[PDB]
């Protein structure tokens, strides 16, 4: 229990990993926005259709709509919401919005652009600092003074804009709304940066929105004087300037600490070095700018960033196109930035306001987007509407050079640098210093190991592998949604895109990666493919509804976790786990660790037998090798994020089971399995003749056995495999007599010709030596609920008490195995998914029979590696199935870490079914 | 310039130095609030006479309003604003959102409660984080969308609530309005704390405000249908809980870094240690409280503070009074705060909502008052409306215990701790932990007096202690932004001082209280010894009648002062000795220059000052007057005075060199002794054929240039006035002009001086003056010099070195141009002259010259006099400097206050308000 104060908040650079735009004419993606900037577009139009259609009544308001300057930037389709995506009823979805629609959708788009799964942030400390300015839908919220509506407080409140975002996405972090007029987005970004720096949140969504709903604000802005341009365009720092115009839109940015963005392997677009914010006092008039105030903002921001303001290559300015504000801004800029510039290194001016207009509270977002895009495409957009340098600004006296044609970056200090300024009409100034990505923030600051023979055989095997065919790897394409119809439609779209030339030119692995870095919704589907044609066929199957040999698609998560069936009675095949050792590294490391342990215990190395294909097997070597492969498989699964919920183990697959439950540790499990195997080795080497036993898989139940031992009292029960079948072992004579009886009673019988007939009577001498060996292990509290087949199948609850002592390993070896009772108890406790970790799946048939008798016929049997199969593909299929059914699996960990934008694909984005959700408001 | 990545932020504790209040019931200072809390008053009332009165016109909404849950903590006087005080016009003032008016007034009240004058914060890094969750005045103001007024965007907006506060008070710091529903205040405070910890502000005014203007929001909040209590009394953590009611009223807090509060001298009311804020996430919807989030805020807050939550005493909580939310808050509290309590330790619980209601965005402002006020009076207030423990929450199970009667402070683990929690209805949660003030956070070669000086000082202190004490003169400083307001404030203060509480208060305490208030444009000062003199002076100020010790002014004097460093024959037997015995800065500087003069010639001037038997020769008088001038000016500059222009005379040039930045100290000492020893040696060796006897005559420059061929060896010594002139020459030609002017009608007052300077007689002496002024460095002056050496022409500030060896060579020979320099000062606006000598002799000449040049309202301030107590004289000069509007820090006139007994509850500032409201046609 530590309570000793947090610690200092170190000043660090803040990476930017995502970005999304809904600008009033620069279009709705950060690739359309870049095209519009690079070409140079104008988003100013007249009132589309009827947008004030509501206030267009009261026929005198109509006159002043056609009397006030009503041009500006508008956004098509303000009314639109996929209410079933965002889980809002029809009666509620119209009382919300429209700024909260834009916020909710822009958060999704920014998270998709950053390529972080939106489902990986639910239940995490993610701050949401959103800046809004006006509440004008609330007017529509109350239009009939004969009724009143609920849902109105949370529907059109201003705080609730930044709360709903935290609600829907389940963000447990500081969620506030900001209001500082025309600078809300920049101060919101500044506060997000501060929150990230003092460790309140790990990822922050920042930005701002703005919507134009009523003409009342425009009418009020009209009656101030000459503040609104008759033309409807904005020419910043030009000879001509007669006012700005008001636009609607919004922007969002996903901020992350630079170390966090390097560790998580994301692509950094640009870093923020520092920022500042202040007020301007007087400022003779509430809406009059100041020079010393803005110079103070610049100085504080650039001292926070730790850079020299005279090495800045570009300055995105406020530039609201005023004959009085612009000279003041230019002089303030030149007093700090253009102070000692040697007349040949001028700072480039340029304002995004000439393309989009004045975006109010979202203005600081829009500029930011530009400065980010120009810092990733390595260009500089030109500023439109510029006629000629203004009389009241002496450009060459300062270091200002208003660009007109797309230039390249003038790196006056080596790396690209920029500054974004924004000044509100209340007097709140903000300035953000945006750098470019740099090399400095992508680079970081005993046991008997393998023997000498192992090296030789490994060297031979690697060349033999490198002297074979060029096999096509198996790639999982993962499609997902929150419903089933959405998943089908998305699969159809992805299949269609995969056939066009862009889809055909894209590598399969890149498409798989881009799919694996998306949202993992409730409904999931996976298509395992080798080339494009197989992928298209499987995606068509998913979209239609049919099944396929290697295509999985379920409707909802399985409620209960898996049960790891640690099997391995008769699972050996001569090439046990050799391919995976060469072609997978975690498997090889865990195998070598187990080899070191086994070498310490017994003397020989499992790795030699595994790699070599000359020596065959035997009960000792078979058991130890199967245990080693089981451990390696379990750790490979748990390296990708798999977690057992219960564990059941049969015979030799018991010790490994212990390690997977927290009932022992790897060394103790190795102890137990090696001692056991050595005991059977020597015992079966000795006991023959008057001591020979046998085994038989007879079709007798637990009760049909209770009336069949009377004739042959000396037989015993080895394993209760299924509630139809059972392994019997006893004297040879009585064994063939029972086979003859089974033949004449309609009962299948088959002899297992294995010397090591354990669990019956041959181990009576051996257990004493066992007592000499295993004494000294330390059982601990089980972190996983074990279905003890040795204790007749009681669901020993996690965390209770150590249950793995020397008697348990003695009794389990001596007495019978209660597999079917344990499985029956498991299916009656909720579990439906069983995962068998064995070289060759043989126990899934027994599990299928037991679960079929127990009532549940639609189970989920998931096998590991098998014979005459590609082991890498088997592992991929097992992990894909785990992903589909809903269990713990990080799909992003399959595909390797990328290098650049060429390792991903331009897969189609998600779609929303937007319906007109508007309120009938008569004024 | 250096740009090297401003260092990190260090997690320090934030002191609260001020506080305001406009809660229901306690509509005033935080001393009525304490009475109402300790009394258990209920501020929840019904609908006032007319509250809405706008939408209560249509006979449809009227019935629904009449059948709604419309009881709550309604405030009186929402429509009253003091327009003239806040400089806004009329048509602008009816628009301004009442939330903005409330914030404007509460900021002033907080700055008064903290005892930090508002005018002292002009144009500095002052952050303004204000929380506000609604603007329903936009409905009324932007109603009638036909002919609506221009001012609705600037006026009734939300980003402007904090921006007007930053504007009016001229705060250059981060100003922002915050919106997180019912947690806004507790969030804003939190953000302010972070600012003070990363260096983006120095004093932060953080708080919240809320107002009920429209019933539509109330009727809507009634919906759902089961969250508004029938009666209205919020019963929190009780068996009965039928909802909550709305309220209005806000609150501010003046936050400072604890180091700043310690260093300045303010009284630390309480200390915030940590704060945290997060969101619920998804639990059961927006308006469904989640418990794991409400435990996480507590854990993060108490790890940010570094405080173990199992030692907190008071858990002032949300207490919304809902039948479901309160148990959830209880489990949240018991999981973190009361987890491991050794079973006595009943984690005393309380809520302020039961006295004032639910204040929405200002809720975190209400609780932060209750916890602070209690922390200032060392006693928990009772919490009303607690019938019995609720069935669903087991109080004794976790650690909980409701408080019902005024209870003393448990002090588990040492000091007093607390915790304020707010949980918004949108999902935002905030928790702030407050400590108690602690013993920490409040605490942490040139010879001097020689042996002979020590002995004489001991004798002088014996003599000083022999005589009894006399009442010290105390300046009472009244100020306002208008003449009428200052008059009214003076009248009210006099009425207060006639009252018994105003009769049992020490005058020093009243002065101290008045010195830490806003110093406006109109100013007035009354210097008094006892209460009746003060009362009569205050009545004179209110009436407008003049008085000896009363000073008053209608507006600031534009140009800066002029330090007339002069004096010829102003010496007497005991100058500069009484204030040396009753002031330590003056004494320190006297000894500082005494070391230098000991270095220069052979001896200490302080010995001459102490001993009263010394016969003041020319050399000794010159150096003593130089030392007195230096100490006087540096004492004046220690209190914040700053000369705008200096002008010397004779031996006044040497000190003007130091006070203009043209020279360092040792340079001025070298100059003054180089002059003095030479004159001292030279004067004795002069006789009948050699003495150039100086005498004053009453002939101006033209009237001496006319009659100058009559008198050959006579010469100008000092141009003193546009009519007078000091002349020097051989005695017979002196007497001849004296006698002729006697008949002509002129005045020939003769000087009995013997070391006659400003003559051709000094030519022999200049040879050693040349060699005794070497090694000094003239330096660029920091302010203008009206040098009398160079004819009197002005010299601009920050130019080139002037006081070189040749400059002093000219100064010791050629005539003094005092009168022309004074007239040149007249030319460029200057009106105030302050004369630094132990006797105001040059003031007469300056007065005559200013009368010549057309100034009849010329402010001429003498510093010291003879046969006048020197400390009283200095207090008078410094009060006059304050009065006229120059740069004097009046708060430094008094001593550091050791407790609340050192201040006086003087009447507060008054706001004369008028009704500003819009038409109600909605």
Numbering used by the authors:
A (entry chain B): 106 to 550, 596 to 1073
B (entry chain A): 106 to 549, 596 to 1073
From the article:
Polyketide synthase 13 (Pks13) of Mycobacterium tuberculosis, the bacterial organism causing tuberculosis, catalyses the last step of mycolic acid synthesis prior to export to and assembly in the cell wall. Pks13 is an iterative type I Pks composed of a sequence of catalytic and acyl carrier protein (ACP) domains separated by non-globular linker regions. Sandwiched between the functional ACPs are the central ketoacyl synthase (KS) and acyltransferase (AT) domains, which facilitate the condensation reaction, while the TE domain at the C-terminus loads the newly formed mycolate onto a trehalose. Due to its essentiality, Pks13 is a target for several novel anti-tubercular inhibitors, but its 3D structure and catalytic reaction mechanism remain to be fully elucidated.
Here, we report the molecular structure of the catalytic core domains of M. tuberculosis Pks13 (Mt-Pks13), determined by transmission cryo-electron microscopy (cryoEM) to a resolution of 3.4 Å. We observed a homodimeric assembly comprising the ketoacyl synthase (KS) domain at the centre, mediating dimerization, and the acyltransferase (AT) domains protruding in opposite directions from the central KS domain dimer. The structural model covers residues 106–550 and 596–1073 of the amino acid sequence of Mt-Pks13 for both monomers. The central KS domain dimer is resolved best, with local resolution down to 3.2 Å, while the distal ends of the AT domains show a spatial resolution of around 5 Å. Analysis of the KS dimer interface using PISA indicates a buried surface area of ~3500 Å2 per monomer. Reversible self-association aligns with a largely polar character of the dimer interface, which includes a small set of salt bridge interactions and about 35 H-bonds across the interface, contrasting with few hydrophobic interactions. Despite the disordered linker sequence between the KS and AT domains (residues 551–595), a stable relative orientation of the KS and AT domains is maintained through their extensive non-covalent contact interface (~2900 Å2 of solvent-accessible surface area buried). The cryoEM structure of Mt-Pks13 was obtained without substrates or inhibitors present in the protein solution. Our cryoEM map shows continuous backbone density for both subunits in the region N-terminal to residue Asp118, which clearly indicates an extended conformation of the ACP-KS linker sequence rather than a turn. As a result, the ACP of chain A likely associates with the KS domain of the opposite subunit (and vice versa).
